[PDB]
UniProtKB/Swiss-Prot annotation, chains A, B:
Protein's job: G-protein coupled receptor for glutamate. Ligand binding causes a conformation change that triggers signaling via guanine nucleotide-binding proteins (G proteins) and modulates the activity of down-stream effectors. Signaling activates a phosphatidylinositol-calcium second messenger system. May participate in the central action of glutamate in the CNS, such as long-term potentiation in the hippocampus and long-term depression in the cerebellum. May function in the light response in the retina.
Full protein segment contained here: 35 to 512 of 1199
Lineage: Eukaryota, Metazoa, Chordata, Craniata, Vertebrata
Protein name per Swiss-Prot or TrEMBL: Metabotropic glutamate receptor 1
Effect of residue 33 to S: Impairs protein folding and abolishes location at the cell surface
Tissue: Predominantly expressed in cerebellar Purkinje cells, CA2-CA3 pyramidal cells of the hippocampus, and mitral and tufted cells of the olfactory bulb.
Note: Activated by quisqualate > glutamate > ibotenate > trans-1- aminocyclopentyl-1,3-dicarboxylate; inhibited by 2-amino-3-phosphonopropionate.
Disulfide cysteine pairs (residue numbers): 33-75, 233-235, 322-338, 376-383
Chain coiled-coil ranges: none
Glycosylated residues in this chain: 64, 167, 341
Amino acid sequence: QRSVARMDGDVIIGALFSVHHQPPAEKVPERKCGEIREQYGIQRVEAMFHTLDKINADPVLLPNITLGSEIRDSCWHSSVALEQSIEFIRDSLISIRKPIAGVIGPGSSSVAIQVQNLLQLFDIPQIAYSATSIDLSDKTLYKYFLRVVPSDTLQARAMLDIVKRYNWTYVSAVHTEGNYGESGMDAFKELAAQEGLCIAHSDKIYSNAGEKSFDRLLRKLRERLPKARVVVCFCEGMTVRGLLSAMRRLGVVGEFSLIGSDGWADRDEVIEGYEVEANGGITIKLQSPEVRSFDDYFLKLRLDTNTRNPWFPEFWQHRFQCRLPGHLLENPNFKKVCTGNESLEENYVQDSKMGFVINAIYAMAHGLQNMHHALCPGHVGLCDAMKPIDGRKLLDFLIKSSFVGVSGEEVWFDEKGDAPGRYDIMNLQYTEANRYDYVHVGTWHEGVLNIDDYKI
Amino acid sequence: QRSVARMDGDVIIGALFSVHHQPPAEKVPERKCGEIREQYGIQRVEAMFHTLDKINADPVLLPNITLGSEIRDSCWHSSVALEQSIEFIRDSLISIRKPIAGVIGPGSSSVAIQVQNLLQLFDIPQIAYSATSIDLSDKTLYKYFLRVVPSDTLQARAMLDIVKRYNWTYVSAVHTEGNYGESGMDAFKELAAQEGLCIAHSDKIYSNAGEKSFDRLLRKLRERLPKARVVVCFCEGMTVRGLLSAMRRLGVVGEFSLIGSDGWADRDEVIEGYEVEANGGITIKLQSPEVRSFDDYFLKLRLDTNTRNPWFPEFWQHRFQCRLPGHLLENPNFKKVCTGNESLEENYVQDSKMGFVINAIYAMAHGLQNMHHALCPGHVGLCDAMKPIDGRKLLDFLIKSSFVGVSGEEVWFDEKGDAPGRYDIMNLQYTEANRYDYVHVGTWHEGVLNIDDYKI
Ligand SMILES: *[C@@H]1O[C@H](CO)[C@@H](O)[C@H](O)[C@H]1NC(C)=O
């Protein structure tokens, strides 16, 4: 009885997008998810629909084979993503006596693991756009998993190389608790122990922990000075902020210099106010420019034209805070009544990772093209060898795929299913105006550390 | 589409039994299974129905909580067992908005792995009765898996202890190639290197290898005499037999003293004709007395009073090679009509592991009782804490369970989910008629070797 986004075709690409936030702590059992999401949700849904459209128009790629998809809501939770993934498979097992060819998603690593653990049973390839856990690289455990996104070892790598470039010997190690935290640090600690660096103080904390928890963290960090000067935070955007708040109450400022992972990146949202305590820090952003195209598509979207996305109505009302002349999903919660002509441009922000989400889809497309070229030579449409499509076949076939990234970037996969790492080094500093801004100071292109030393 | 055995209750225990043989080599894709099975199938089906009945009758075990089950056909194949297992979960996810509480089965280890890999993703405990492979003990990989029978490893300890009891210094090491062979031997070879024993000659061979392969094995074994006097075979049934055939052509006779694993056990099948080449060997059987009760129940089964087993009709006709006039399940292959009241005794042989299959069920029962005693205090029936039942909770619960085996035997589980050792020491010798009979000469109850020395 949960909603599903469908668009028909010859080969159906199935995706898992966090359309709604995850179910509240106590409702997980009955699997009723929370409020709707635009960035990690409605956009990506529309992104897939859109992308898939551009492709059915490209006369070069997948000529007379239409790509269709079935998009399900992951609610950013294993509990549900699995609930849905089952259905991918249930349905598939049936149209064998339309089936899924592969799956784009899910967004979280800790979840993509669950999806992969289930999806791999049934020879369904899985391409991910933001799952950076480094456990996924173990192809003995996650054989049918790949990503259009780099692995996090590559990030502990770039962070270490940053620590290397500046002749540093002792660095504190703080990271967010969980998978994102452990994975990366586990790779830094080790990648570090090799290159020589001696890890000074080492701690771990939950992003949603009390001020008490952080204060205890800040103390410990300070006590290990002056060696524990450089703190390396493989931390979630808020683990950092939390650490800054601990610096506010303790009134210390300028004691620590930081190096943070894409959890922090160049988000204003993290150093809000705390511009000072969190100044001069260096962070890793993810290399990915906003898609020219998508913006033009996701904005001229109307409440009465969009026929394929059953969530729009819900979304739309939540996005403008208003309720309709009755409907089926009339969201009562509101006092105002939608005109239906509101503009999606007020406070519009394209999904950050939005670039990746598309690459992923393409890989799934390209993968199919190649499978076709080899298994149906000369043939224009789909031949008996791809009716139905073979899992393990499409898999190694996706692995051996290369295409022009959504932004003139090159895209391919190594033997483990990972992607090449292109990072951006960010530094927080005082410019000319009254602004504390994130200044781009360097790049990391697979092993190549480029820092404009004079810009820091 | 595929039939399912269903008995309603308050907590539904799900089971996977090989009702049919596995689908022929080339039909696996469409998943159509072969001929019906009585021992590994109809009996166990009936065994579960039966057992569950005695438990709904026991005044003490689950007083006002009826145990029900849903029994599905595994066809002794991953392809299908998974197909069905999905349904356990499909259904289960649904009643959350009747669900499975746990699963008895499957039969094979290589399969139980697939079932466990899927069943674990949804917090469904899994109790197995004949899956003995060692890998399942890794709880980091098969967290929700346990059994009421020991691992293969245990065996080694008992085989070695047998070697220890007789003051032997040099033994030959032969075993089957594959999962079984390597596992056990790997544990012997090591358990042996500790206790002191010096491994003389050491070899490994495939059960389905040519007479050439074995002859080469036999030679090598002999050459290492008189030290390589005691050969320790951690071998499948036929690996042994094959070795006997090698002794026939080379015309040699009992130069060796064999010690074989449950692959050989007390199977007449293995020493067919070669009663002489192999007479005297010592083997390890798995203690499993026949169930008094079951026999009485399975035999008085009428084709018209037994409605809960949908397979009976099919089975019945295949068991007596006759058809049933105008039936919804009338078989055409046969020539003469079924009297309907043929006797199920002609050549009746109770399932060998039939004892285990029941223990398993009980554990699932007992497990539930305890979760009830702990979580529904004051309530006689099921309380909101068990509506629905919690996976991870029932599981570690099951673990901490202990009950009187179906045959006085004690039953519990260690922290990995494995069961206690209960090997029976069989020796082949000449008794009273022209029968070479396996004679029971000793037991191994977790570390305790007991051999009636005078009986050998
Ligand atoms: C529970 O079952 C027993 C007999 O099996 C009966 O005496 C008792 O009344 C039952 N309890 C309830 C609440 O019905």
